[PDB]
Scaffold this active site. Structure first.
Site, PDB file in Angstrom:
ATOM      1  N   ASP A  25       0.828  -1.210   0.000  1.00 46.08           N
ATOM      2  CA  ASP A  25       0.000   0.000   0.000  1.00 46.08           C
ATOM      3  C   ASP A  25       0.860   1.258   0.000  1.00 46.08           C
ATOM      4  O   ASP A  25       1.255   1.731   1.067  1.00 46.08           O
ATOM      5  CB  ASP A  25      -0.937  -0.036   1.209  1.00 46.08           C
ATOM      6  CG  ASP A  25      -2.024   0.980   1.122  1.00 46.08           C
ATOM      7  OD1 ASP A  25      -2.937   0.928   1.979  1.00 46.08           O
ATOM      8  OD2 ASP A  25      -1.888   1.854   0.243  1.00 46.08           O
ATOM      9  N   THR A  26       1.108   1.824  -1.183  1.00 47.76           N
ATOM     10  CA  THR A  26       1.890   3.054  -1.258  1.00 47.76           C
ATOM     11  C   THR A  26       1.137   4.250  -0.700  1.00 47.76           C
ATOM     12  O   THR A  26       1.754   5.302  -0.490  1.00 47.76           O
ATOM     13  CB  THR A  26       2.358   3.346  -2.689  1.00 47.76           C
ATOM     14  OG1 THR A  26       1.219   3.525  -3.543  1.00 47.76           O
ATOM     15  CG2 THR A  26       3.209   2.208  -3.214  1.00 47.76           C
ATOM     16  N   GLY A  27      -0.174   4.129  -0.475  1.00 41.73           N
ATOM     17  CA  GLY A  27      -0.977   5.160   0.145  1.00 41.73           C
ATOM     18  C   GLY A  27      -0.997   5.104   1.647  1.00 41.73           C
ATOM     19  O   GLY A  27      -1.647   5.932   2.286  1.00 41.73           O
TER      20      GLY A  27
END
Ligand SMILES: CC(C)(C[C@]1(c2ccc(-c3cnn(C4CC4)n3)cc2)NC(=N)N([C@H](COC(=O)NC2(C(F)F)CC2)c2ccc(Cl)c(-c3ncnn3C(F)F)c2)C1=O)C(F)(F)F
Lengths: 99, 99
Positions: A25-27
């Site tokens: 999850d880059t968010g």
């Protein structure tokens, strides 16, 4: 390896003796896992996303096996609808976005 | 290009002729933007799970440029912490995770 994004990018991790499926999850600033036992001290935190906030316990210096690596980082534990590997761990395994 | 994850992967997008900052988010199925005006009709969608759920407006076939890459796809509008580019558009621009 290259992970495409046509599906949710899920991986298997090992943490605290347990195997879990988790989302790359880059968010997410930090890794967030469903309720589980972890060693050491913790402090409470609130984390926000779509729909509001949840309360979690923050553990630091946790070892996680992921993508063939042994990475150390902060793990937040609480009522998350999905297990999430956040940037704090993704950097340690050399994961990048590319296009 | 390659984007590392030591900071939030915020990039400039263009939509409706206006530049905005948005987060490249592999943990997001969908693209969700802060309140703005978009053309045409919208339909309802419910997203969320972090402390609750939000209603968003779904617009289809919207032109949006992400780091110079032109995409046309579904954009949701609603109360998000920051503009989010989700997998529906990350795939259009050829983005992958790599380690
Ligand atoms: C780390 C967070 C932020 C959680 C979060 C997440 C990811 C997947 C699920 C998930 C997957 N499957 N399931 C269901 C089956 C059980 N739940 C649930 C939550 N991860 C993430 N990237 N996003 C962004 C918003 O990120 C942000 O705000 N980032 C921040 C930045 F803006 F500042 C840091 C705030 C997002 C945007 C748009 C969409 Cl549509 C979705 C999305 N896709 C799918 N569902 N959802 C849902 F959320 F709408 C997610 C999250 O909300 C946190 F912290 F809450 F835990």
């Amino acid at each position: 390896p290259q992970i495409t994004l046509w599906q949710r990018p899920l991986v298997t991790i090992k943490i605290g003796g347990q195997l879990k499926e988790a989302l790359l999850d880059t968010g997410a600033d930090d890794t967030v896992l469903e309720e589980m036992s972890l060693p050491g001290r913790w402090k409470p935190k609130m984390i926000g996303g779509i729909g509001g906030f949840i309360k979690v316990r923050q553990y630091d210096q946790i070892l996680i096996e992921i993508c063939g690596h042994k990475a150390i980082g902060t793990v937040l534990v609480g009522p998350t609808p999905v297990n999430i590997i956040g940037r704090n761990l993704l950097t340690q395994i050399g994961m990048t976005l590319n296009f």
